[PDB]
Design a protein around this ligand. Sequence first.
Ligand SMILES: [Zn+2]
Ligand SMILES: [Zn+2]
Length: 214
Amino acid sequence: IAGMVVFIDPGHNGANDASIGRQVPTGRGGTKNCQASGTSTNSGYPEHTFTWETGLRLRAALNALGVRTALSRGNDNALGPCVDERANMANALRPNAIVSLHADGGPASGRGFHVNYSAPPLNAIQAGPSVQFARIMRDQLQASGIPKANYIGQDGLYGRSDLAGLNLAQYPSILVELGNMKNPADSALMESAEGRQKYANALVRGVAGFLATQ
Ligand SMILES: [Zn+2]
Ligand SMILES: [Zn+2]
């Protein structure tokens, strides 16, 4: 899998202003907000820092495997690109795999991951390789000890039509919600360097697993 191209997207920006309410295409004919601030744990640990820090670990491990990588953003302290631009950046790289990282803000009772993929598919890639990617990633996250969400999606998977990053993708692309920041157990993982590394190692498996099918 050495030499393959992976686009990594740590969801959200390190900082925001009024410009995130700017309307950008959804990829399905409508518009949505350029960005969203994202959620956080009860103690104030932000989604945007979690995805940034976890993405860095993911990036490092893939780099060590000889995999080519690029980030949707390069910091956690300034404005980042809108959600359509992050898809366009990826498309320009014609990647073998695209992975977006997020963390949920759901009912405290719920915990665990779910993998989002574009549905119904807008192209052959979204209909095939991306679904295969989502399934492989789900199995690898599970085999690594990350529990599947029991409160959202079904069986750790979720067909979405509302995500611009997924809708606009022309290359294998999934968006992983790693867990629920509002859940005490999930947040304990997220707020820890050790937990973020576990998340990252699991992600590497899912990515490497899918890249190996190319
Ligand atoms: Zn913040
Ligand atoms: Zn998010």
